[PDB]
Symmetry: C4
Subunit: 147 residues, 4 copies
């Protein structure tokens, strides 16, 4: 549809800021956590991939977030904002698609309602004219009866 | 409501660029201030948390911003843009919610006006038809009197 | 036109996040690839220019992306998101211009419809008045015949 | 006005990405230019302030951009995108304010035009009723003349 196309620039804005959310937390994770957890945060590539695993729910079983929380108790100030902001972006990707569809339906229902009323207005006036003409004929008839 | 749903992608754009503002000023604060103030800016994690305290009005009493200003007189070129842009983003988070509500009310009031007028238009024309029919009948009555 | 003016702030948002996409992948490319490929990723300036060549379809013949893929088999986790997100932004630059034009046309057509109906409504009622007045006159004529 | 408030979240988006435009070119400028031009790009703080001078037109007389162009001939690939993208952001700050005002005027003119037509529609039908009633009275008068 050419109303989904309407919503694509905003989708890229969300998708763009989503990958930027990974990079800023990937750098952050490397400094905070890389020395104690080289396998998970020892580098930017290692951090970006550890963050990816957390978001794709391959971290319930081998839950990277939790052993880091053990060694560093305040580590939730890192993880909780990450999981929240990156879930909220993924949410907005679907919302933008949902809103695009429901907006197109809503606009279509409103043209339906205007021409629905514009039809009723047409028909009510047209049937008044029809009643006018028959009535004006009767007047002219009664007028010839006087002549 | 499913009109607050409509404003969420823009909320995330503001929320995303807000955390972006911390990271860019956290890096800048580390470079400018980390050597003279290692407890406050000696690292990216230290800088990000010093900036957080400033925005959460903790530094109303120990005031991190001001002793840095004292050693570095130009330091307001760092702090003033930070406090302004970060506050303006937090402001836009609430504005986006306020505008979402007031726009839903405004759209309701407009449908209320449009069927208010469409009702008056219907009633005024229906009343004319009623007047028509009683008149037409009287014409036909007087026409019978001539026959 | 002063409706393309309306779409410019969103154009800059796309253009801004596009150059953002280069920088974040330029840093990531340097870390991942700079040691094995110093001519292509040994620095941030080298990485930003290698990414530029890939997007401008220069690497259709010397194909920087592919020998990196050969040494690093996982390298598509870097290249594929890059080519997708950067192309999707460039796409949204043209969409924003297309949507701006088609929306100005759509709004024109709607004013054209609304005065099209407002004209028909005026003419149908004015024609009824004209019918009224000629009728009223004939009533008064026949009323004089009775006097 | 509470329609300027409507436009503020988009203003922050432009203002946000503007400061991000400085930081990414400030890092870029430091690596490309810092070794040969330590006074202008030797650090991130030095680069961010050299970029500021260029944009605030304190670089015609002491034109930092030009001696760098001399030593590095391809340096316009850095400066030209910088000056363009950061001018285009500042432009969009004023456009967002202009569009906010002209939109409020345009919406106000359209309510003026609807109640202008809704008044004409009211008055034309009301004067038809007035002509109805006088006419129906004449019919009843001529009907009593027959009785
Ligand atoms: C984007 C925001 C992401 C939030 C990252 C979490 C905050 C990082 C953090 O915890 O900083 C570590 C605390 O360092 P701290 O400031 O306590 O060090 C004082 C001197 N040793
Ligand atoms: C955001 C984009 C800003 C554009 C920055 C300008 C591009 C930076 C640049 O010129 O890179 C320098 C060229 O390095 P080069 O790739 O030629 O080095 C090859 C191995 N020595």
């Amino acid at each position: 549809v050419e109303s989904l196309m309407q919503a694509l620039p905003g989708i890229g804005w969300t998708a763009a800021l989503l990958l930027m959310m990974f990079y800023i937390f990937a750098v952050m994770g490397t400094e905070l956590f890389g020395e104690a957890f080289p396998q998970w945060f020892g580098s930017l590539g290692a951090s970006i991939y550890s963050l990816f695993q957390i978001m794709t729910l391959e971290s319930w079983s081998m839950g990277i977030a939790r052993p880091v929380m053990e060694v560093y108790p305040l580590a939730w100030i890192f993880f909780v904002p990450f999981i929240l902001i990156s879930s909220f972006m993924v949410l907005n990707l679907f919302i933008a698609i949902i809103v695009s569809a429901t907006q197109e339906v809503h606009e279509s229902e409103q043209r339906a309602e205007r021409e629905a009323n514009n039809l009723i207005a047409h028909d009510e006036r047209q049937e008044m004219l029809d009643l006018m003409r028959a009535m004006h004929a009767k007047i002219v008839a009664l007028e010839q009866q006087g002549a």
